[PDB]
Amino acid sequence: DSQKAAVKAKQAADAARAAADAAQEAIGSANAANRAARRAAAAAEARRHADAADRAADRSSALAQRAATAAYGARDAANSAAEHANK
């Protein structure tokens, strides 16, 4: 269960890292949308970037949900390990 917790914790870390990267994807697209908007002031491009940022947001959210799930798994494994240690 300790090794399980380590694995599930690793999965949480991997999903969390991926979520951080997804945030950077959304940010990069948002910055691109801003530059396109400045050029427009280009509209089609800014909208495409906004859609890409929105997709990145969905990826980040899903990854955060997976990270939380993996963390819950690690917590349950830790709880079982604690019970086993107590026994």
Partner: peptide, 9 residues
């Protein structure tokens, strides 16, 4: 937040 800002742009 970035997606919402991107939409605003």
């Amino acid at each position: 937040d970035a997606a919402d800002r991107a939409a605003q742009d």
